[PDB]
Design a protein around this ligand. Sequence first.
Ligand SMILES: OC[C@H]1O[C@H](O[C@H]2[C@H](O)[C@@H](O)[C@@H](O)O[C@@H]2CO)[C@H](O)[C@@H](O)[C@@H]1O
Length: 390
Amino acid sequence: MKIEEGKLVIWINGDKGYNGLAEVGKKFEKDTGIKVTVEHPDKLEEKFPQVAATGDGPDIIFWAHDRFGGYAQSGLLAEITPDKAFQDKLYPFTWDAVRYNGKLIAYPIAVEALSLIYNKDLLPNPPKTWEEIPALDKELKAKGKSALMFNLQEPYFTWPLIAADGGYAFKYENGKYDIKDVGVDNAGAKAGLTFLVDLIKNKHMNADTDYSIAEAAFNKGETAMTINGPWAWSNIDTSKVNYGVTVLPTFKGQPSKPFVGVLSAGINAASPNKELAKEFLENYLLTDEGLEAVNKDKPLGAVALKSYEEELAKDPRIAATMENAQKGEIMPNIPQMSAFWYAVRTAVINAASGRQTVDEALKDAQTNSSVLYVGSKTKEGVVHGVATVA
Ligand SMILES: OC[C@H]1O[C@H](O[C@H]2[C@H](O)[C@@H](O)[C@@H](O)O[C@@H]2CO)[C@H](O)[C@@H](O)[C@@H]1O
């Protein structure tokens, strides 16, 4: 087989606590002799389905739940078999996130949402509104700093602002998402993206800023604010910055609405190690000690495991995560999410760079948002012979 029998290969995004996860893997190996190798490939959410479609890849894939319906529909995921006693250990909300066509398709790990992160020494009183950011930036620029830097390459980070005044992905009614009813080019979405583009045109932000650039600037103390998730807190702890984590600014008086993700672990349908993967996930990772090892590396957010309590008091950063999560919406897990995200990525990048107007960018994204992975689609070469055209 392509996937090696008798070991586990696990893929997780490079922003998460892969070192802590590897520690859990080493404990599994110490107890059972089964080697666990953790990797963090680039473009994971795309690499996984490409390799899994050919029966290759990791035994276990970690990503937010929104990608998993597409993976399931394409036959890339094993059926998971947690018993009732195991299911009882995790919050019902988190199982809901990984339920697709009635089946649980992955193990939920933790709830993630973006928050506003700010430097208390530069900015003891962070802005309550998006609208006050230009004036704040002007003052900071005179002091050799800037107001705000965050990743402008992934639409996840701009979505909270696009959604604030009325943008939405897929309409949800009567227990169903309507894939023909998209909210990407409505008045609310246009208002939010226009605000973002104005920030860039007015030199308060730079369209080229990505995750690494924003993190480096915030953690060096060059910018007063950033927008990020729980995984980012570890590096800020290491930094010299005295930081707060708080509610995102409002726009037109309405809350920013981050899309809430549940980090989840799926088992590759091609894996010959499905029972090993179940043992590892249920009995090693989704335990107080397992989650602690990952969380101590990079924070997970609000974990799915009911029993977990490694602190004496609440973590105010988690409280802020939850406040933002409650203001936002849970991502759909439907297969159409990949098309939505590709479309909105294009719109934000093109509007931010000036390649298109906001109206044109969102018009296209609306059209483009409204099975995914099979060998004969995902293979990089041709599958028919040239002779066929004769
Ligand atoms: O930007 C589109 C992207 O958004 C989400 O990905 C997040 C992920 O959920 C977070 O955990 C964070 O760590 O990384 C990503 C942002 O760069 C969706 O989950 C993903 O499918 C989508 O492509």
